[PDB]
Amino acid sequence: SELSFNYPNFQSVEDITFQGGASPRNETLQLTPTDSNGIPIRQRAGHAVYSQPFQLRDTSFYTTFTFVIRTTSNSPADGFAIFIAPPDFPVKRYGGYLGLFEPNTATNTSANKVVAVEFDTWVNTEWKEPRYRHIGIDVNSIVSVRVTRWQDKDVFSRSIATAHVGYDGISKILTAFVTYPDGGNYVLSHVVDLAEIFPGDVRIGFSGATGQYETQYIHSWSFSSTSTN
Ligand SMILES: *[C@H]1O[C@H](CO)[C@H](O)[C@H](O)[C@H]1NC(C)=O
Ligand SMILES: [Ca+2]
Ligand SMILES: [Ca+2]
């Protein structure tokens, strides 16, 4: 179906739903909470989602957002993701599950219905993932189907980074491009039939989790979808 929105900043959150530890703060979406002293709270997850459902049958979309990772040590955890899931998808487990999975089914593709582009700051030993910080495409599992190295210089840059995520509904391909000002660029794509996974309605949004020593912020976001028919 056709949907468009545009948030150059979050002075308005009219159409954004916050769940778990996420909240609007300083004209941003703050995905995980901080205490009254500004310190990241450990072991929390949060979602900030566009409230209106849409359909993926015969649909292409383009979305872009800007983001900042604020770290308070060289060992931040856990990261954040942009995700698509059914409209009643709740905030799930904190830590390396990124708010998107739970321990007993996190690697079981038959037990999940969620697609995401993750920005992963903490190398988990509890399931397979690369030995370095990474950006990945996840299809129904916390073990990414496509994953690439995310350079530490960019992770810790303090920059406002940009992501572009697109889905071509004819070729059935999800793509992310991530760019840093005067830093790295990242390209990842995967063939996945989203309408097969999600025959009904979905929402798109962000999930963040701690972890420790990290807060994730979304500074702007826009989206457009169009019919392929
Ligand atoms: C365990 O804690 C670290 C931080 O010390 C990370 O948050 C990691 O993801 C956690 N493990 C799991 C399985 O969530
Ligand atoms: Ca990962
Ligand atoms: Ca991880």
Swiss-Prot record:
Optimum pH is 6 for hemagglutinating activity. Heat stable. Retains hemagglutinating activity after incubation at 100 degrees Celsius for 30 minutes. Pfam families: Lectin_legB (PF00139). The keyword Amino-acid biosynthesis does not apply. Ca(2+) binds at D120, W122, N124, E129. It is found in: Secreted. Keywords: Calcium, Glycoprotein, Hemagglutinin, Lectin, Manganese, Metal-binding, Secreted. The keyword DNA-binding does not apply. GO terms for molecular function: carbohydrate binding; metal ion binding. Disulfide bonds: none annotated. Mn(2+) binds at E118, D120, E129, H134. Glycans are attached at N26, N108. One of its GO terms (cellular component) is extracellular region. Monomer. Hemagglutinating activity is independent of divalent metal ions. Has metal-independent hemagglutinating activity towards erythrocytes from rabbit and human. Hemagglutinating activity is inhibited by glycoproteins fetuin, asialo-fetuin, thyroglobulin and azocasein but not by free carbohydrates. Inhibits ADP- and epinephrin-induced but not collagen-, fibrinogen, thrombin- or arachidonic acid-induced platelet aggregation in vitro. Has anticoagulant activity in vitro. Belongs to the leguminous lectin family. This is Lectin. It comes from Bauhinia forficata.
